[PDB]
């Protein structure tokens, strides 16, 4: 069902992982109907500075909500499919420009679709299933900032070995530098 | 000591080797008097971190209730230091068991912005943001004289 899973995007890794989803269905008692109406747009591969590797899953919003409902076990079985990997869902959310001084009939761009709130959704969605509780930014004398993200501790062990992949993927997707911290 | 503790060399124009626990700054270094291969440093996440060099890596980290401004080792004993610490205190640590402070000298009224050992490994001077100077004889743990 590779054409029945993709969204106008036949690429070999995407087809392999959509076949993995077909395997999920055919080996799954209820997940067949659980995920059958759920599709995505694309998948992307990102390697880490640590030498490991991770994957990102660009999906429109509603099926992303579905994955927010049903993610953890899906990540478990997809990890078992592609051993030695990390996995992340993400939402392709559009950006809209600011009209200039000489601008035609355009709309007042969304506060949500503005450059910031989108990136904030990347933050929170990436960090999911665990939650965020702070954001610091330090300004050292040499004009050297540090952005920092205070996570929570409900998922502590299974996440403590996600942080490097997290940092790397967010750098790859935004060009930002972020440092993750958990007050134990 | 800067963003990340670089171990320099005099001959090599570039940082010989970088060291850091977590990507916070580091506000104070001091080596030790014996075991010339052991380093200690404190950083703006209120932490004391011990490092080795002959093993070349950080070795231990403690996070206190408030930052330490400067630490020094006692040239007689090689594994006890004092940490002068903004909570108006001079905390005397032994190295191995950093789950407890051997002493806590406690008689300033503002932060303690530097500290040192009489090279006769008995006496401590603590200079504070409050315009005074203490001396402590390391076995008691209140102020012994104020200049």
């Amino acid at each position: 069902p590779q054409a029945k899973i993709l969204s106008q995007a036949p690429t070999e890794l995407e087809l392999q992982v959509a076949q993995a989803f077909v395997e999920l269905e055919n080996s799954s008692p209820e997940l067949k109907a659980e995920l059958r109406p759920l599709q995505f747009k694309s998948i992307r591969e990102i390697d880490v500075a640590g030498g490991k590797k991770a994957l990102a899953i660009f999906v429109p919003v509603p099926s992303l909500a579905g994955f927010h409902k049903v993610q953890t076990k899906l990540t478990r079985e997809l990890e078992k499919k592609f051993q030695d990997r990390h996995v992340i869902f993400l939402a392709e959310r559009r950006i809209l420009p600011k009209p200039s001084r000489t601008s035609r009939q355009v709309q007042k761009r969304p506060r949500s679709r503005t450059l910031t709130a989108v990136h904030d959704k990347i933050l929170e969605d990436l960090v999911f299933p665990t939650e965020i509780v702070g954001k610091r930014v330090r300004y050292l004398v040499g004009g050297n900032k540090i952005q920092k993200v205070l996570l929570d501790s409900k998922d502590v062990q299974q996440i403590d070995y996600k942080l490097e992949s997290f940092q790397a993927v967010y750098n790859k997707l935004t060009g930002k530098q972020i440092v993750f911290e958990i007050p134990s | 000591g800067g963003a990340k503790i670089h171990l320099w060399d005099v001959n090599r124009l570039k940082p010989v080797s970088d060291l850091s626990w977590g990507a916070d700054n580091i506000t104070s270094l001091k080596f030790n008097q014996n075991e010339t291969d052991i380093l200690a440093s404190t950083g703006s996440d209120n932490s004391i971190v011990l490092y080795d060099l002959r093993t070349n890596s950080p070795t231990q980290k403690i996070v206190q209730t408030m930052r330490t401004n400067a630490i020094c080792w006692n040239p007689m004993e090689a594994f006890n230091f004092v940490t002068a610490n903004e909570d108006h205190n001079a905390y005397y640590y032994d190295m191995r068991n950093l789950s407890r402070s051997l002493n806590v000298f406690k008689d300033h009224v503002s932060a303690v912005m530097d500290v040192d050992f009489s090279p006769t490994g008995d006496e401590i001077v603590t200079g504070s943001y409050d315009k005074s100077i203490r001396i402590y004889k390391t076995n008691h743990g209140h102020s012994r004289e104020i200049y």
Binding site: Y161 | T55, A78, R96
Partner: peptide, 25 residues
């Protein structure tokens, strides 16, 4: 990865503890 770094550091700590124990002696 971070955890192997962590365990490496703990081993370092054991080594330093040994050396300093002889200085204790």
């Amino acid at each position: 990865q971070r955890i192997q770094q962590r365990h490496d550091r703990k081993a370092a700590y054991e080594i330093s503890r040994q050396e300093v124990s002889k200085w204790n002696d």
